[PDB]
Design a protein around this ligand. Structure first.
Ligand SMILES: CNC(=O)c1ccc(Nc2ncc(Br)s2)cc1
Lengths: 43, 266
């Protein structure tokens, strides 16, 4: 278990994420996704 | 995305869901990992397609966000909002029952999220504590859309959900609509405050009987306000159930809720 994923380092990162939200619509919602009809086909 | 775009932290739940960190943004999320071969063997491909299609298009502070998804040779990965306070059902079990402030806050959040869904003709159909997670400040997050349906025009027929939460119209084999979620919200409010669902019985037939008779028996410790809200949701006739806007405006909800909207970008 990496340091970032436990104890105080995690708590701190989580708090920071709540109070400083990132633009998830741009950062993740604009990036291409596989077609739902492709999910069970070749990758 | 690929799996190498993420630092895997630890398993969160076995079903597998992992606490993960997206490398370039140092952004902590949950990664749900599903096996393609198992999904095909079990025959649940279209079921999964539908769940992803519904959840990935919902954006509300009290609905667990699906940021994106990707796949490789053997697996499908769902990039999900991390709910740091975890499972609501575990918190309920730990405490036995919630106080009025906690319950009213959850009810306001639930009604808001369900209103958002219903405005898009999405019916949830399985509201219960086990399908809810909790955010950084304890905010309700609808986590799971396993029984959900986009129902724009046709009334529905499928019996679905969870025994203690089933509305009369499902049990009786009638068609149903979005008002099923209103019934389940009433059952949920009762379970929050009491610690047991209202129609709890030794047998499925006796449970069904209690539901269709709305055999509601309030414990003495409940406030008049809480009983008023529950009674107005648990109506036999779907059109008579208190609307979601009505839940949010209910005096007991107004007097007791301590709801906080999360900070938004930016
Ligand atoms: C032992 N697991 C936990 O304590 C736990 C489980 C789940 C959790 N949050 C989750 N967020 C999103 C999903 Br999807 S699960 C936080 C903490």
């Amino acid at each position: 278990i990496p340091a970032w994923a436990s104890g105080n380092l995690l708590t701190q990162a989580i708090r920071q994420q709540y109070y400083k939200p990132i633009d998830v619509d741009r950062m993740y919602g604009t990036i291409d996704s596989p077609k739902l009809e492709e999910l069970f086909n070749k990758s | 995305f690929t799996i190498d775009d993420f630092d895997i932290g630890r398993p969160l739940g076995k079903g597998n869901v992992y606490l993960a960190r997206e490398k370039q943004n140092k952004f902590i999320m949950a990664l749900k990992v599903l096996f393609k071969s198992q999904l095909e063997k079990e025959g649940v491909e279209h079921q999964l397609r539908r769940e992803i299609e519904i959840q990935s298009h919902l954006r509300h502070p009290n609905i667990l966000r699906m940021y994106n998804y990707f796949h490789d040779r053997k697996r499908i990965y769902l990039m999900l909002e991390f709910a740091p306070r975890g499972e609501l059902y575990k918190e309920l079990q730990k405490h036995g029952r919630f106080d009025e402030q906690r319950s009213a806050t959850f009810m306001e959040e639930l009604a808001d999220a369900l209103h958002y869904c219903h405005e898009r003709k999405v019916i949830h159909r399985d509201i219960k504590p086990e399908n809810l997670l909790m955010g950084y400040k304890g905010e309700l997050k609808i986590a799971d859309f396993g029984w959900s349906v986009h129902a724009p025009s046709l009334r529905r027929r499928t019996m679905c959900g969870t025994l203690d939460y089933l509305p009369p119209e499902m049990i009786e084999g009638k068609t149903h609509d979005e008002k099923v979620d209103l019934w389940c919200a009433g059952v949920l409010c009762y379970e929050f405050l009491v610690g047991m669902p209202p129609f709890d019985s030794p047998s499925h037939t006796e449970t069904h009987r209690r539901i269709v008779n709305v055999d509601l028996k309030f414990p003495p410790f409940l406030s008049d306000g809480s009983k008023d809200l529950i009674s107005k949701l648990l109506r036999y006739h779907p059109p008579q159930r208190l609307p979601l806007k009505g839940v949010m405006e209910h005096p007991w909800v107004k007097a007791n809720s301590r709801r906080v909207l999360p900070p938004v970008y930016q």
